[PDB]
C-alpha cells in the first residue's frame, strides 16, 4: 500500500517505516560547493563485461533490469568501497515533466530522471542479509537529462510496452549496462539509505557527476507505463521519486577537482 500518490506517497511512509525520519536517509541535495574533494578516494571500478541480464520487470513503482548475481560477474569495487559488490538490478526514477524526476539534486537542480544500479556486498552472502548492514549495498546513481538519445537505452525503452503493467516481466538477456554509463566516473559519495520502503540505512551512495542524455521520445516511453495492474483505474507511472531528505550529520565527498 505505499506508493507515490497524495495519500500513500513519501510524506506518509514514516507511519509504516519510522526509519524514514532516521539519521542517514536518501536521497539528499548535493551542495557542490560544500562537498569536499577527498584525494584518498579511489577511482570507481565498474566491471560489467560479464553481466548477465536475465529479465526486465514492472514492479508497480518502477521497472527493473535484473541480473544473475549468483557469481561475481558484474561487480563494483574501489571508489569509497571496501570489498566487492555484485550488480543485482537497475531501475529508474522519473518525472511527469522534464524539470523533475531525479531523487538526488545538485545545488537544488532536479534532473528529468535518475538511474540506480543496485549492488550488494558479497561479504554478506545474499541481499537480504546485506540489507541489514550499514555497508550492505552500493548504489550507483546516474542523472538523465533530456536532449539527444542514449542509444544504449533503446533496447530497454522498446520492451516497456510489454510490461505496461505491474507484475509483467520479460526475458532481457544480453543487455549490456555499460551502454547506460556517461564518459566520466567522477562522483560524489555519502552514506545513506534505500529511497523506497523499507528505507533501510544500508547504502553507500555513489552519484556520478556527469549526466547521460536521453531523448524526449525515450523518456516519454517511461511515462507511458502504469502503476496499476492489468485491470484498475489507469494511473500513469510518473513522479516515482522521493524528495531530498535532511543531510543531518553527514559529509558528501567528491572524487574530483
Ligand atoms: C521506484 O523505486 C523502485 O522501484 C525501487 C527502488 C530502490 S532504491 N531507490 O534503490 O532504494 C530499490 S533497492 C532494492 C533492490 C532489490 C534488492 C533490495 C533493495 C528497488 C526498487 Cl524496486
Ligand atoms: Zn532507486
Amino acid at each position: 500500500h505505499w506508493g507515490y500518490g497524495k495519500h500513500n506517497g513519501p510524506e506518509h511512509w514514516h507511519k509504516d517505516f519510522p526509519i524514514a525520519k532516521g539519521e542517514r536517509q536518501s536521497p539528499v541535495d548535493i551542495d557542490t560547493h560544500t562537498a569536499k574533494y577527498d584525494p584518498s578516494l579511489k577511482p570507481l571500478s565498474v566491471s560489467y563485461d560479464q553481466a548477465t541480464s536475465l529479465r526486465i520487470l514492472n514492479n508497480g513503482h518502477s521497472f527493473q533490469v535484473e541480473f544473475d548475481d549468483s557469481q561475481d560477474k558484474a561487480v563494483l569495487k574501489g571508489g569509497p568501497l571496501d570489498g566487492t559488490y555484485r550488480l543485482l538490478q537497475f531501475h529508474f526514477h522519473w518525472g511527469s515533466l522534464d524539470g523533475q524526476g531525479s531523487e538526488h539534486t545538485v545545488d537544488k537542480k532536479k534532473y528529468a530522471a535518475e538511474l540506480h544500479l543496485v549492488h550488494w556486498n558479497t561479504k554478506y552472502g545474499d541481499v537480504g542479509k546485506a540489507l541489514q548492514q550499514p555497508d550492505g549495498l552500493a548504489v550507483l546513481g546516474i542523472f538523465l537529462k533530456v536532449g539527444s538519445a542514449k542509444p544504449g537505452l533503446q533496447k530497454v525503452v522498446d520492451v516497456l510496452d510489454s510490461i505496461k503493467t505491474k507484475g509483467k516481466s520479460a526475458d532481457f538477456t544480453n543487455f549490456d549496462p555499460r551502454g547506460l554509463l556517461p564518459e566520466s566516473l567522477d562522483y560524489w559519495t555519502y552514506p545513506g539509505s534505500l529511497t523506497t520502503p523499507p528505507l533501510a540505512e544500508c547504502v553507500t551512495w555513489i552519484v556520478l557527476k556527469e549526466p547521460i542524455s536521453v531523448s524526449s521520445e525515450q523518456v516519454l516511453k517511461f511515462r507511458k507505463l502504469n502503476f496499476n495492474g492489468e485491470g484498475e483505474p489507469e494511473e500513469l507511472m510518473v513522479d516515482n521519486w522521493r524528495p531530498a531528505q535532511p543531510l543531518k550529520n553527514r559529509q558528501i565527498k567528491a572524487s574530483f577537482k
Side-chain angles (χ1 to χ4, degrees), residues 1-5 7-257:
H1 124 292
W2 64 268
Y4 293 98
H7 305 268
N8 56 7
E11 291 329 295
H12 287 275
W13 298 350
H14 71 100
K15 274 167 271 165
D16 266 345
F17 303 97
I19 197 70
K21 296 184 194 298
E23 300 301 311
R24 58 172 283 179
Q25 292 285 299
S26 294
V28 302
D29 182 57
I30 297 166
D31 187 83
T32 67
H33 280 111
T34 307
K36 190 181 146 110
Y37 168 59
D38 186 344
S40 80
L41 279 175
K42 299 156 135 266
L44 197 64
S45 171
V46 179
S47 277
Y48 287 175
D49 75 303
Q50 292 297 332
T52 294
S53 65
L54 264 36
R55 203 168 60 151
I56 186 168
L57 173 87
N58 187 333
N59 64 32
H61 305 294
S62 185
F63 69 88
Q64 59 189 55
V65 174
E66 284 151 15
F67 291 79
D68 172 14
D69 60 348
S70 67
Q71 288 186 69
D72 288 355
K73 284 174 155 206
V75 309
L76 184 68
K77 26 202 208 242
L81 302 176
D82 284 349
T84 300
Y85 287 70
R86 269 191 204 159
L87 176 64
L88 171 60
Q89 58 109 290
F90 64 80
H91 59 272
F92 298 79
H93 308 263
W94 59 91
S96 52
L97 309 160
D98 295 349
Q100 62 196 60
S102 70
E103 298 207 305
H104 293 91
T105 57
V106 182
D107 296 337
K108 296 302 176 84
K109 179 187 170 73
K110 298 165 163 76
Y111 285 89
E114 189 170 329
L115 167 57
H116 288 163
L117 294 129
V118 178
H119 313 71
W120 59 272
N121 190 335
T122 62
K123 79 178 169 106
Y124 299 125
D126 69 69
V127 74
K129 287 289 184 163
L131 286 174
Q132 308 179 66
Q133 319 299 333
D135 57 356
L137 270 63
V139 184
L140 180 63
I142 300 176
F143 295 118
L144 278 59
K145 68 179 191 168
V146 177
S148 63
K150 185 72 156 168
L153 183 56
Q154 197 60 29
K155 286 183 189 186
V156 165
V157 155
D158 279 333
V159 79
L160 294 183
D161 76 291
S162 77
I163 59 149
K164 175 168 168 173
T165 56
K166 173 161 44 61
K168 294 202 151 255
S169 69
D171 284 69
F172 212 64
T173 50
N174 303 291
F175 176 76
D176 191 337
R178 290 174 318 181
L180 289 178
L181 308 178
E183 282 179 8
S184 178
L185 299 175
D186 287 351
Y187 62 89
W188 298 279
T189 182
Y190 71 97
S193 74
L194 306 182
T195 73
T196 50
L199 300 169
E201 290 185 332
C202 61
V203 178
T204 302
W205 274 94
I206 297 166
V207 179
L208 290 191
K209 173 175 178 195
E210 185 178 355
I212 59 165
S213 287
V214 303
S215 64
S216 73
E217 302 86 354
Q218 287 183 318
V219 72
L220 284 174
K221 292 169 197 43
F222 281 10
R223 291 185 191 141
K224 297 181 83 183
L225 290 167
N226 298 163
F227 286 130
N228 48 291
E230 198 183 350
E232 323 150 40
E234 175 172 18
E235 283 174 79
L236 292 177
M237 185 179 277
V238 296
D239 298 316
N240 55 359
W241 42 282
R242 185 191 200 193
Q245 303 301 306
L247 189 59
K248 298 195 182 165
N249 176 55
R250 292 178 290 178
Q251 288 202 342
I252 307 180
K253 301 179 186 164
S255 71
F256 58 96
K257 249 137 41 139

